[PDB]
Amino acid sequence: LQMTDGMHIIVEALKQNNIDTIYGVVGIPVTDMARHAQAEGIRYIGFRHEQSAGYAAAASGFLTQKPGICLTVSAPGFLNGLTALANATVNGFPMIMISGSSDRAIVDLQQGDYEELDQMNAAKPYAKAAFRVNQPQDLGIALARAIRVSVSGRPGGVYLDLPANVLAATMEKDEALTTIVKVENPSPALLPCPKSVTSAISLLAKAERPLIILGKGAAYSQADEQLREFIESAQIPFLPMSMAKGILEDTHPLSAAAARSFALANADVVMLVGARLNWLLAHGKKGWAADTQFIQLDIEPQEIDSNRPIAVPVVGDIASSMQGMLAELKQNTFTTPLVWRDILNIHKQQNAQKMHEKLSTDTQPLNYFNALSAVRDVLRENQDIYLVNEGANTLDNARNIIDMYKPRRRLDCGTWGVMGIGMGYAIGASVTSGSPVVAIEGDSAFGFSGMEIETICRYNLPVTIVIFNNGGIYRGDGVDLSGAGAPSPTDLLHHARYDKLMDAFRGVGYNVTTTDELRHALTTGIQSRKPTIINVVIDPAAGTESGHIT
Amino acid sequence: LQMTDGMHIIVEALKQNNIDTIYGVVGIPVTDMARHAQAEGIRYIGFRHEQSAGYAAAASGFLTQKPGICLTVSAPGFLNGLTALANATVNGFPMIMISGSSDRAIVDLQQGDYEELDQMNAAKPYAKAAFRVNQPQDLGIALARAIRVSVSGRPGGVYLDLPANVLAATMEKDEALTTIVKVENPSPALLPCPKSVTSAISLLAKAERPLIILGKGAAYSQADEQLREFIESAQIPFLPMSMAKGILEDTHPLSAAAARSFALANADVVMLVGARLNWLLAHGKKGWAADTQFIQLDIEPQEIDSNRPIAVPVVGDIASSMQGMLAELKQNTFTTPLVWRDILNIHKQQNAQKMHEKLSTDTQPLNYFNALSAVRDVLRENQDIYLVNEGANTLDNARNIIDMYKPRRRLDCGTWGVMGIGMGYAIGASVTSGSPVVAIEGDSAFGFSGMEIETICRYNLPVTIVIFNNGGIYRGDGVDLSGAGAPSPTDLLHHARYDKLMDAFRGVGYNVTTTDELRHALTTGIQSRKPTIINVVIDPAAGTESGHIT
Amino acid sequence: LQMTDGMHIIVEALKQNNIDTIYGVVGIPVTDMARHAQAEGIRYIGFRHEQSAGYAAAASGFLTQKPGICLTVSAPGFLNGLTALANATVNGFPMIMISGSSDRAIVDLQQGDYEELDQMNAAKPYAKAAFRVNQPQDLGIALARAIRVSVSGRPGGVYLDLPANVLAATMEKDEALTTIVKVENPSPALLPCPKSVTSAISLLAKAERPLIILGKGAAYSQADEQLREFIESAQIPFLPMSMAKGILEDTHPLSAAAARSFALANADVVMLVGARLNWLLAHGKKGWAADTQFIQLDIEPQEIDSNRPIAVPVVGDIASSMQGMLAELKQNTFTTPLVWRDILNIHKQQNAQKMHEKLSTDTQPLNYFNALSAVRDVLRENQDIYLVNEGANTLDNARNIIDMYKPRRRLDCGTWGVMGIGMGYAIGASVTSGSPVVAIEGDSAFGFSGMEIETICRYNLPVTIVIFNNGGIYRGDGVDLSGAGAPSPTDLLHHARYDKLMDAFRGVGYNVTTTDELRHALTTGIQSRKPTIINVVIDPAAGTESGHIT
Ligand SMILES: Nc1ncnc2c1ncn2[C@@H]1O[C@H](COP(=O)(O)OP(=O)(O)O)[C@@H](O)[C@H]1O
Ligand SMILES: Nc1ncnc2c1ncn2[C@@H]1O[C@H](COP(=O)(O)OP(=O)(O)O)[C@@H](O)[C@H]1O
Ligand SMILES: Nc1ncnc2c1ncn2[C@@H]1O[C@H](COP(=O)(O)OP(=O)(O)O)[C@@H](O)[C@H]1O
Ligand SMILES: Cc1ncc(C[n+]2csc(CCOP(=O)(O)OP(=O)(O)O)c2C)c(N)n1
Ligand SMILES: Cc1ncc(C[n+]2csc(CCOP(=O)(O)OP(=O)(O)O)c2C)c(N)n1
Ligand SMILES: Cc1ncc(C[n+]2csc(CCOP(=O)(O)OP(=O)(O)O)c2C)c(N)n1
Ligand SMILES: [Mg+2]
Ligand SMILES: [Mg+2]
Ligand SMILES: [Mg+2]
């Protein structure tokens, strides 16, 4: 009569649900679980800090619509992972953080257990759901719930708490197998009200100056061909949000990106496709026409009327909504006013010329424009890469200058503006895709996850880390206002050589000061498939400090 | 008519309350505050991640009884800092995390503000109190509350939330000055019931086998001379918990450390001095006599009877309680039974011999014992250092082998067993004391805060980081059980050279493989006062993996 | 071999800790527990709603310094009791609410258990501590914790969660008895810093116009004789807060009550004794001298400097602090300036004149002043009674007009101004004391707990309920501003006859429209010891509506 235990049950449940990879940091009580998951054919990726493990899991979820799995220990590891779970929920990336926890009886009495925390309740504010499994026979259904919650509705983070006792708990093997649940279609199609689709098309056809905004929800939906067909059929100018860049190529003739300010100031009907009217769009206030009318395709009815009143909500999943939108358009065709497309193109050209001037003017030291022009030179020739990006000036300029050619290839600071997502997102992207990654990193930003370069080396991952070294936060020319000569609050070490970090882990380093050197280093980085750091010397005075001037 | 603003008011309040140092990471909306604090003479220490900034603040609080100040931005930075605030509260270290927050109106409506989070409510589970200041005239009293809460009762973390609007808000300068509060004596003496003191002494005098346990609460109290006088007067064997090592020197004749298991198994009366009967003491169950009677000196009445029933609670602050305990002993002297001290010494000697054998037997590669014997050789000659320590085997063995000679010189993983406190604790210790720090780090442990080596270099801090490189978590000889040849979940990169990391920041690196090399490198590290990493090659099979074997 | 179960263990634990009474409402899973507690000689008082059970428990706690026990079922009953637990914690009244809960496994997975709620975490925001007991061997220590937490520091509510499984769980009886914990002295003396006592006396001695404010913390402490001795020795004018009335008699020559506004506006040094500078004292702002200097005796260091900076904090328990204050006064005697006392008396005289004027003037219908004068006449001659009071006009006028002669006899809406405490407070006071109770109730206030008149009848409790029936909330002469003739939002039924409710339960009812009728009815009610309602017809226009006038 064969027995098994909780730890074996949960691994089998993960296996049956097509989990291929776990991202984590081990320790009591989950080391055996990780070892056994790896024994059973799941790829285990161990990190230097759980935050990056959680970011990697979230990245994998965004890219695939299958929740990323993050594994942590109890309280101290759990809390580190929770910061990443929170970010997944805020951005809408599906993942499950699985954490060991301690003795329920001791923790419930606050007696000072090993790594004591009510982790389930701790996670609740930051997750779509937090579940805790006390009986090994409930592990299968618990994971089924976790999967469904993570990927349904607006996707997000779920916390799954496994007390040490449940991992050790035994039951008969044959019986245990009957309790494992393989979830089919955890996020089924949800189709919008046909009347709302009809109203959406009717309003677009009446519009003098329509604009589509594609958010990362649009990207996530993978409805790439349908979105392109709709945009091209009615010739509707579109604006891609950061992680929606590439659904249509950034150089597409209908992209209004190069005239973003004008487009938002003047559009009379704006169709939001999986994009929130949050701070990233100034809440539809500053910079917008006074009486913009909105159509909004979103799966989350709670998002409607959060900021500006929405004239035409289209509630349902974007793929399904676009099916209806396309069928309605076919029956009631329209063409966006030529004069609107023309005026957009006039503004786009003026701005493109101003940009070109900056990109093409060499300086010493390098600035953000000529440095990113060099990067763009290389990426234009290496279009099958993933791009991770974080920083302040490093982020905003790379977003503007680096064109995406394919969808779901750009991963950045996102909705909460998190510095520290770089290495995790690179590891998750690389593991998930098998493709090279280029991480364009601010020097401050890099410092939040920089130890994970050892993880990149340990797994021989094709990540090239390009650090825009301006010697600090926003700028590197700060002064201690007391006169004491200390580093200012935004200064980092003068002329640090981040490339040299790779020596410790047998990776590759390049120091670059010119566009020619940068082009050569980055080309070699990508083609070599070797873990590489490129230290780029950037004018300490080139950047701008974000925020209000008093 | 001169005006000022919230940001100026809070800095002046910090100044008036003798805050000398702020540990933080800047960005919107706190960059100006940090710049101005530095202008006004406060030392600003900027980190690569807020977690280490928070750990540094907590360390400074433990060492001084003045709350450490940690400064962060809104949501993403706040959450990183919160993990450290939680650790301060769990350990009982006084600190205040001051964080910027966003627009109260937008956040209260969940409209998707920049870095949106109800941070005040987020912090509540992890802090003694979380306050939020909406009016600049309330900044003075808010800081007064924060100071009092952080250092009174059981000390801990307090969260102080400063919305961007309060920092910008103006008022008349003369009026503003009248609203600033300088707190005198925020943690006043609290004396125990005299009858409890009488009962405590009476029970000790009746005891056949009394034992004092000194916890880090005892250390924190700074009642070093009183504790020594009491212990020496009645000749009571004592056991120092980890961060209480050194209150009396570890080689003191009455230290029962070398017979810890015997002492706990046999003592009939145990006097807990600022030490919880939590997991670190097996909750007074496994390894303890069946009917141990307890005396407990603690400031927190809620701690009494958490685990074992306490026969004699002595509730009050330890310095005050020891005043009464000493006065009562003087009036009613006793001597601990000689036969108890003798049997303790018999066990201590046997264990010391077993230890000596391990310490003195050279091996190749080095193991934990001979490597820490080399460290002990050096530290015996450099007794005016601070010791930071984290890891699993690296922690337990260094705790056992490295003697402390002075109080409040040892900082480690603490109550929650956190990996990642090393660099923050080193920075906080170094800045607070002006003394050299030796950080004895596991290689996994180091990876949780390793980027802060740049911070150490930026401020030219005398920190020597000694990394016990066994190539992974607990051990470095793991195998992928699938047969695929991947790194196992506990393996780190084979033969990483952490010393080489310092090259990037113009620090010093040593690689060591023998005790002679280790002695030389560590001696040079300390004496040079230069930021140094020592990479110690440790037998990958020397350590033990913690946890239960199934 | 004799077995027992968790239900028997917790009952024995309550019995050993001198719990004499449980206030509750039963149902699954606690009915058997109540039956058995009652079998074992604990008095069981069953209510019509858990909120009143919780208020009764809190009142018992305030009167005795022994935590009142409230027993409820799972989710629905728990949540009702929680509202009362919250109120106890806000007011600082010691109590333990013990609730059954459902199946931890099902609730942790949110699968829709019977009465599903994580009650332990639900309670945390409203309680000093929330504990949940999973193993029957831990019941004794859990109760010990709950007791100690509830009465130590600032007393408050504690939540104790008993899953149905722990109640049914068995263990050996002999072993179970060894796990029961009898708590001795759960709130021991905590003595103030001697320097703070010296400073307090020195400041009072220098004061031209000193004033003591006695709060309900002072009443709770039971230091009646010490407080009186101090006040009378130095001849310090005092102001009692509502539930501190009667520590010294309200007609005491040194009471500044009749000149409260004058006293607060003109005192130069104010000594708060167990009283917060919260809204009840206008936060030390409106109506206070501009630069009042405060002395504050409080057990809670976190309370110091919450509102106005406190010149002399005296942190410790009031009984201990007053021992010190008296000793220090005896060595350094003083009396307050006679001029200050004489001038206070001038102002009291003026206000008492105007008060007794209104009190003595008949009207038809009755108003608050002449009605409460009649009440005052009777209560003067029955100084053994407890006074419960709630309403708006009914509360404020009764507080001013009805003098208390003995301490801890007045129970009211308290710090959160709760309507709905009346019946519960009356039942708790009557059961605790064995004395008659008079509840002076607004008609709206009464409606919040009125069904508990059946409970009063069921237990034949000597409660006389005097309802000030003005036909509404504040006033009874509101008008529907639409012109439709509906009751206004503040109107209750015209000429309701609440005395008739007693007929349902075989109680006594009186309807009164004159002061002579009221005198007779109230005298008869108290003397008869029978449950009685007196419906007092009050002029609908007599009251004032509280709040800001636009
Ligand atoms: N498959 C889907 N169908 C419809 N809406 C989706 C889908 N996936 C995500 N969403 C919605 O997409 C939106 C993403 O918005 P946001 O994260 O603000 O994007 P951006 O930052 O690119 O503007 C969310 O409101 C979310 O509910
Ligand atoms: N000055 C003080 N006086 C009395 N008790 C204190 C003081 N400072 C801290 N404490 C108490 O000291 C205890 C520290 O215990 P703990 O952190 O468990 O130490 P350890 O890990 O060394 O056993 C806490 O229970 C805390 O309330
Ligand atoms: N035994 C005691 N010794 C000292 N302070 C106490 C004691 N019991 C309660 N307190 C304190 O008494 C205060 C009561 O204040 P509060 O409820 O505002 O009274 P009031 O409403 O009468 O002004 C609280 O601050 C509490 O901490
Ligand atoms: C976790 C976290 N901490 C702090 C911030 C505040 N912050 C915004 S940008 C930034 C870094 C900007 O400097 P860098 O990455 O070097 O980019 P640069 O502008 O210099 O190119 C920081 C720390 C944040 N967004 N997230
Ligand atoms: C934040 C956090 N994550 C994970 C753990 C689990 N954990 C316990 S010890 C340990 C590291 C042990 O390895 P190392 O520091 O290299 O010490 P060694 O035993 O190898 O000397 C970890 C990751 C923890 N305590 N804290
Ligand atoms: C639980 C609760 N709900 C509502 C209120 C608001 N409130 C203040 S006074 C009051 C009743 C006032 O009317 P009444 O009790 O009849 O006294 P009157 O002034 O008419 O004498 C109410 C409902 C409250 N304090 N508590
Ligand atoms: Mg930078
Ligand atoms: Mg190691
Ligand atoms: Mg009324």
Instruction: Report DSSP letters for A336-365, one per residue.
Output: --HHHHHHHHHHHHHHHHHHHHHHH---SS
Distances (CA, A) of A375 to A353, A367, A438, A526: 19, 12, 10, 12
Picking from B23, B501, B546 by the largest number of A CB atoms within 10 A of its own CB, the best residue to mutate is B501
Chain C residues close to B196, C-beta within 8 Å: 185, 188
Asked if C1-188 and C347-550 have one fold, the answer is yes
Q: Residue B279: which of A44, A113, A283 has the nearest Cβ?
A: A113
Distances (CA, A) of C22 to B111, C139, C143, C159, C461: 47, 17, 14, 15, 16
Output the six-digit token pair for A154.
């607006």
Q: What angle do CA B55, B57, B61 make, to 5 degrees?
A: 115
> Would you say the CB of residue B471 lies under 6 angstroms from ligand 2?
no
Return d(Cα B382, Cα B99) in angstroms, integer. 39
Write the CA distances from B38 to B7, B20, B56, B258, B427, integer angstroms: 13, 10, 18, 47, 18
Q: Which tokens belong to B444?
A: 């996994």
Q: Where are the domains of chain B?
A: 1-188, 189-346, 347-550
Cβ neighbours of residue A378 closer than 8 Å, sequence gap 6 or more: A519, A522, A523, A526
CB pairs under 8 A between B and C: 96
Which residues contact residue A178 at a Cβ distance below 8 angstroms, ignoring those fewer than 6 apart? Answer: none
Taking CB atoms and a 6 Å cutoff, what residues make up the pocket around ligand 4?
A 391-394, 417-420, 442-445, 448, 468, 470, 473-474, 543; B 25, 27, 73, 76-77, 80
DSSP code for A281: G
Question: Ligand 2 pocket, B92 CB below 6 A?
Answer: yes
The domain C1-188 is classified under which CATH number: 3.30.1300.10, 3.40.50.970, 3.40.1440.10, 2.40.50.140? 3.40.50.970
| Atom 13 of ligand 6, residue of closest alpha carbon | C473
How far is the centre of ligand 3, averaged over its atoms, from the C-alpha of C275 (Å)?
Answer: 5
Cα separation, C237 vs C260, in Å, equals 11
- Atom of ligand 4 minimally distant from the CA of A390: 15
Distance B500 CA to ligand 4 centre (A): 26
Q: How far, in Å, CA of A239 to CA of A255, rounded?
A: 6
Q: Which residues' Cβ are closer than 6 Å to ligand 5?
A: A 25, 27, 73, 76-77, 80; B 391-394, 417-420, 442-445, 448, 468, 470, 473-474, 543
Nearest to A83 among B83, B279, B447 (CB): B83
- Cα A503 to ligand 4 centre (Å): 26
CB contact under 8 A, C305 and B129: no
Burial of C91: CB neighbours in 10 Å, binned 0-12, 13-18, 19+? buried
Q: What separation in Å is there between the alpha carbon of B92 and the centre of ligand 2?
A: 7
Tell the residue nearest (CA) to atom 9 of ligand 6.
C392
Residue in the block written with tokens 């003109």: C266
Q: How was this structure determined?
A: X-ray
Residue type present at position B376: R
Check C302 against B192: CB less than 8 A apart.
no
Minimal Cβ distance to B448: which of A49, A277, A457: A49
Superfamily of structural domain A347-550: Thiamin diphosphate (ThDP)-binding fold, Pyr/PP domains (3.40.50.970)
The 10 Å Cβ neighbour count of residue C403 is 17
Q: Is B50 in the pocket of ligand 2 (CB under 6 A)?
A: no
- For A421, residues 6+ apart whose C-beta sits below 8 A from its C-beta are A55, A87, A388, A390, A411, A412, A413, A414, A449
For A331-346, b where at least 16 C-beta lie within 10 A, e where not — what string? eeebebeeebbebbbe
DSSP state of A288: S
* Residue C154 assigned to a binding site: yes
User: Position of tokens 């470095």?
Assistant: B476
Sheet holding C410-412, edge to edge: C410-412, C386-390, C437-442, C463-469, C532-537, C508-512
Closest Cβ opposite residue C148 in set B141, B187, B304: B304
- Which residues have CB under 8 Å from C455's CB, separation 6+? C45, C46, C47, C48, C52, C423, C427, C461
* C interface residues, B as partner, C-beta within 8 Å: 128-129, 141, 144-145, 148-149, 152-153, 181, 183, 185, 187-196, 301-302, 304-307, 309, 313, 315-316
Give the angle subtended at the CA of A105 by the CAs of A102 and A107, to the nearest 5°.
Answer: 55
Binding positions of B are: 28, 114, 154, 216, 257-261, 276, 298, 318, 351, 368, 392-394, 399-400, 417-419, 443-445, 470, 472, 474, 546-548
CB atoms within 10 A of CB A388: 30
Instruction: Give SS3 for B160.
Output: strand
- Read off the DSSP letter of residue A65: S
β-pairing, B210-214 vs B437-442, is unpaired
Token duo for residue C353: 């004149």
| Closest approach atom of ligand 6 to CA C544 | 19
The rounded distance, in Å, linking the Cα atoms of A493 and B547 is 41
Give me ligand 8 centre to Cα B215, in Å: 27
Question: Alpha-carbon Rg of chain C, whole angstroms?
Answer: 25
Cα C333 from Cα C327, distance rounded (Å): 10
My answer on whether omega of the bond before A240 falls inside 30° of 0, hence cis, is no
* Helix (H), strand (E) at residue A23: strand A21-24
Tell me if residue C532 falls in helix, strand or coil. Answer: strand
d(CA A63, CA A409): 8
Alpha carbons within 13 angstroms on the beta-carbon side of residue B356 total: 6
Say whether A458 and B487 touch across the interface (CB within 8 A). Answer: yes
Answer yes or no: are the C-beta atoms of B507 and B457 closer than 8 Å.
Answer: yes
- Is C444 flagged in the annotation as binding? yes
**C-beta atoms of B189 and C187 within 8 A:** no
Contacts of residue C238, defined as CB under 8 A and 6 or more positions apart, other chains included, come to C211, C212, C213, C214, C231, C248, C252, C254, C255, C256
Q: Which two tokens stand for residue C218?
A: 């002072």
CATH superfamily of C189-346: TPP-binding domain (3.40.50.1220)
Contact yes or no for A545 and B39 at CB 8 A: no
Neighbours of C546 (CB within 10 A): 11
Instruction: Tell which residues of chain A come right before a gap with C–N over 2.5 A.
Output: none
C-alpha of residue B435 to centroid of ligand 2, in Å: 25
- Which ligand sits closest to the CA of C422? 6
Q: Return the beta strands (E) in C352-429 as ranges.
A: 386-390, 410-412
Contact A32, A44 (CB under 8 A): no
Chain B: touching chains (3 or more CB pairs < 8 Å):
A, C
**What gap in Å lies between CA C367 and CA C390, rounded to an integer?**
17
